[PDB]
Symmetry: D4
Subunit: 113 residues, 8 copies
């Protein structure tokens, strides 16, 4: 269980050392930051697009090395997409989800993909 950065922006503690992945993650941080300022549709579309794109790219990256933890990782991703598709305004959940997802599930593939 990890601290929540305030302002809710990416920092180097989240580095995975996959620069594409890090740069995509910076966009998910910003997406949740916007929602945290104004819970509207422009902001949710922005987070949703970036989330869908990042999860699919990262999924491809895992598949390229036939990663053993893919299926568990894809199921995590798909549950979060689902929250976003039924958004409830729960920004705290999202701030939390992303921090733990990166620092636990994404950190797990390092060196394996």
């Amino acid at each position: 269980g990890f601290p929540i950065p305030d302002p809710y922006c990416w920092d180097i503690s989240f580095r995975t050392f996959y620069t594409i992945i890090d740069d995509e993650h910076k966009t998910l941080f910003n997406g949740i930051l916007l929602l945290s300022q104004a819970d509207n549709a422009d902001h949710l579309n922005e987070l949703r697009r970036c989330t869908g794109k990042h999860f699919l790219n990262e999924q491809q990256l895992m598949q390229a090395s036939q990663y053993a933890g893919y299926a568990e990782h894809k199921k995590a991703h798909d549950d979060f997409i689902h929250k976003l598709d039924t958004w409830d305004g729960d920004v705290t959940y999202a701030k939390n989800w992303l921090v733990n997802h990166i620092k636990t599930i994404d950190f797990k593939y390092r060196g394996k993909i």
Copy 2:
């Protein structure tokens, strides 16, 4: 319910702001315009090729961000392909279909893909 441009050619009111998508749409406008001048096989092949290519590309673009409205959008596309594969010479239907498809279904993904 939108006006039908006369001559039946693309205009900037159809811009989606995805330049690839706009350029592909210009070819569907021209395809229906040819048919409207001469309902023959060279012209239907031309529209059919451009339609099949555009729908698949746009479908890929939607898939890249895991778009929530994909399945409804693909079903729309597939119904129109089907009309083209059983062409009946109904050019008015086609002039209409395309205008509404862009201005309603395609305009819906803007900002999300």
Copy 3:
């Protein structure tokens, strides 16, 4: 002197037999038709973007087979860009230039690239 279509849209007489080239060409017809409707910045941008992109892509196709007429063709394209970048509103010139460019200069690469 080739006939100028009316409406100024692409027709199958312009076919080069390269489907990507033909699809790009349709966007150049459309750009000149919009300017003929309203000589403004939006329309000139649309045409200028599509012209720049088509000229570059067709140049790349030429280079891929080390086409012997490349230099002369590139020079023809660059001269038209200049005209678009110093636009004086002469739509008639543009309408003519495109019809003659396709049917005499683009048609000469058929079978060689």
Copy 4:
């Protein structure tokens, strides 16, 4: 003079309508925010990598449509890189430079590339 966001993160007012460009831009906001938190080599590397990559990619997008403002834009980008390669810690300059670059120089290519 445009307002400087606080927190210094991207917002939808910076939208260019090119999703890849906007996603890159978010990483430049983030790089300058990290430096504002701690002026060190890690943070400067992160910003400098993301700036180098975004400038190159946006230059390639410009070239693909033979954008007429390419030279001047490239020169603006190269001048900023120089500032990053001779970094003196002036975060205020950087914060300003990015906001003005996006809203005045990047915004001028919209519709042309």
Copy 5:
């Protein structure tokens, strides 16, 4: 029912006007020509590789425009692969099959893909 070229090499009567497709077809002609000179394994491997590659590429090309005649065309291809995988030395069959396949089935997609 078409003539069999002697020597069994491609000629311009087989042009489909898809240069990639034509160049791949030239390799199938050569493959059958080798077998016709020496029915051995080096020669069958050579034809088999080129055949498998060409059929898959051409299948992709058909899929890119959602070609209506794909399934019939793929079934043709797959039957010929199968003959090659159970080769019987019947070179006349192969000389024949290829000529008709191109001039009837492949000529059918022209203008549609």
Copy 6:
């Protein structure tokens, strides 16, 4: 049944004449060599990543020419992945498996893909 190179590193007797394939194989040799020095997780992750990547790439290469021996070859690959996912420290098995796999199963596709 082939000799095991000592030191357990690739040599030109393993050349398949597909340079991509050879270069990937060099990484599997090194992976087993590390494990042979220290049976730890950094080393198994390294072999596992390289193995998964190589098997998928080689599988793609086979698929591109519709290789007849694909399914048998993929089943071989998938069994070895499975050993690696349930590693038992049996380095001798692995030194052996790889030598025979290349010199028998991989050597079989030469000239066919």
Copy 7:
């Protein structure tokens, strides 16, 4: 002096072990055989397109490994293009030139690219 095949088609003695290169080479044999049948513009176009494309692609393969014989090889290719661009109908020269080019100059890059 290597033997000149009759019919002037590629055979497995010309194998370079690079499947894309060998497949391109087959199209150069074919281009010279067509000219030997009928010295016309169609045939010369076919050969000239395939020669330009093969020379460029093989040059790109050379460059990808920073091949030390690149300059000399490129010069050999450019000299042949010149001969095709100043075509005098000397098919015998062409037949010889290709056999010697492959077996002495192309064969020297084997294992180095």
Copy 8:
């Protein structure tokens, strides 16, 4: 002065954190080990191909982020190629050069590209 591995193979101390770079580096260790076993043309070709390809690819990675140390790094690589193109059999030099190149010059781009 860094230690020279024995056997002269890559180990995880050489990790750059760029998986493609690390996989290429393994092929350079292998090339120098083969030469240490037998100083012949086959082995020198293998090393020289892998060195040329790795240097080019790593140069392209550097350029993609407009890496400020590009020029100096390229010069280091070009000097080694020269040594390989004027090979005198000094394997000791090579063994040293690679260890120092990776651990001092390649390591300096980490986080910047």
